[PDB]
Design an enzyme around this catalytic site. Structure first.
Site, PDB file in Angstrom:
ATOM      1  N   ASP A 152       0.808  -1.214   0.000  1.00 55.57           N
ATOM      2  CA  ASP A 152       0.000   0.000   0.000  1.00 55.57           C
ATOM      3  C   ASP A 152       0.848   1.274   0.000  1.00 55.57           C
ATOM      4  OD1 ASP A 152      -1.336   2.310   1.530  1.00 55.57           O
ATOM      5  OD2 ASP A 152      -3.051   1.028   0.942  1.00 55.57           O
ATOM      6  N   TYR A 202       3.434  10.321  -1.524  1.00 60.48           N
ATOM      7  CA  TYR A 202       4.598   9.958  -0.734  1.00 60.48           C
ATOM      8  C   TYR A 202       5.871   9.951  -1.548  1.00 60.48           C
ATOM      9  CZ  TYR A 202       1.069   8.413   2.590  1.00 60.48           C
ATOM     10  OH  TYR A 202      -0.011   8.356   3.430  1.00 60.48           O
ATOM     11  N   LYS A 240      -2.815   5.747  -4.530  1.00 60.78           N
ATOM     12  CA  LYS A 240      -3.831   6.739  -4.244  1.00 60.78           C
ATOM     13  C   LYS A 240      -3.582   8.054  -4.968  1.00 60.78           C
ATOM     14  CE  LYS A 240      -3.704   4.879   0.634  1.00 60.78           C
ATOM     15  NZ  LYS A 240      -2.214   4.614   0.742  1.00 60.78           N
ATOM     16  N   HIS A 276      -7.335   9.769  -2.229  1.00 55.07           N
ATOM     17  CA  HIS A 276      -6.608   9.968  -0.960  1.00 55.07           C
ATOM     18  C   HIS A 276      -7.394  10.721   0.097  1.00 55.07           C
ATOM     19  CE1 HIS A 276      -2.240  10.005   0.767  1.00 55.07           C
ATOM     20  NE2 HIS A 276      -3.108  10.085   1.768  1.00 55.07           N
ATOM     21  N   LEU A 278      -1.601   0.531  14.383  1.00 56.37           N
ATOM     22  CA  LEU A 278      -0.936   0.336  15.673  1.00 56.37           C
ATOM     23  C   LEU A 278      -1.095   1.557  16.548  1.00 56.37           C
ATOM     24  CD1 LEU A 278       2.334  -1.574  14.690  1.00 56.37           C
ATOM     25  CD2 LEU A 278       0.179  -2.472  15.618  1.00 56.37           C
TER      26      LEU A 278
END
Length: 262
Positions: free
Chosen positions: A48, A53, A78, A111, A193
């Site tokens: 992913d 980025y 995205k 996004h 997380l």
């Protein structure tokens, strides 16, 4: 000798997505190459990223040079906010494919629902086309709110396969998950997380009870609640740690106790 089968989530368009995937975040191309290589080596088959980025070349290089067939890897990217629009999305996608060095993506996501509904509907119109052309296998969204999903479903007649949203034990997104379930949209958790609760006594206790790490407990909670997860650890040890979540189950009490963390 047992090999845990990574569960897939069957999506509303008939495609299946591995329930665990590897999240690339704002890392460099060279870092992405190493990390994605490590993930694929660890047994991840779902990668992913996002165009903003700036690491699609490196993600693409690790995938194409992994020794795993393109067909056996699920790849998501995205469409970034400044590229929203019909023609501008088609252009951006072409550029992303050229960077990734492949001729399709498994999942393309919008996004953000920014900067306007009109703009994202035109982007969605372009995703529909890319899907009709067979260049994107599944189309979905990221960071969409219930009002954005309602407008997208009402105006286009095409329901996103999933909405990727920030979701972790301190931010459980009960409302959106209820909407998703109501309208056959899968929930995908980014930053699953959460916030470094590694020192939380509930989670520590559950980790001991099961002889697993706190991160493994969090990721199992996600798996059992039906979330697709894309943990984004950068260190090899953590990449491997996050993969080993299919060799055990929580129980009823465990789930109640984690729910109380929100």
């Amino acid at each position: 000798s047992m090999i845990m089968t990574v569960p897939t989530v069957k999506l509303n368009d008939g495609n299946h997505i591995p329930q665990l995937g590897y999240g690339v975040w704002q890392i460099s191309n060279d870092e992405a190459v190493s990390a994605v290589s490590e993930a694929l080596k660890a047994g991840y088959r779902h990668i992913d990223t996002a165009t903003i980025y700036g690491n699609e070349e490196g993600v693409g290089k690790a995938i194409n040079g992994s020794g795993i067939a393109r067909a056996d890897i699920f790849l998501t990217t995205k469409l970034w906010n400044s590229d929203q629009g019909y023609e501008s999305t088609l252009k951006a996608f072409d550029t992303s494919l050229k960077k990734l060095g492949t001729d399709y993506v498994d999942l393309y996501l919008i996004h953000w629902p920014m900067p306007s509904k009109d703009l994202f509907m035109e982007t969605w119109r372009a995703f529909i086309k890319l899907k009709e052309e067979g260049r994107v296998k599944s189309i979905g969204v990221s960071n969409f709110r219930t009002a954005d999903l309602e407008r997208l479903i009402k105006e286009s007649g095409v329901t996103p396969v999933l909405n990727q949203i920030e979701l972790h034990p301190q931010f459980q997104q009960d409302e959106l998950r209820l909407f998703h379930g109501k309208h056959d949209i899968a929930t995908e958790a980014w930053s699953p997380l959460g916030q470094g609760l590694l020192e939380d006594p509930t989670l520590k206790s559950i980790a001991e009870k099961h002889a697993k790490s706190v991160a493994q407990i969090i990721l199992r909670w996600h798996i059992e609640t039906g979330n697709i997860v894309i943990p984004k650890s950068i260190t090899p040890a953590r990449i491997k740690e996050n993969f080993d979540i299919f060799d055990f189950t929580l129980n009823g009490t465990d789930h109640d106790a984690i729910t109380k963390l929100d």
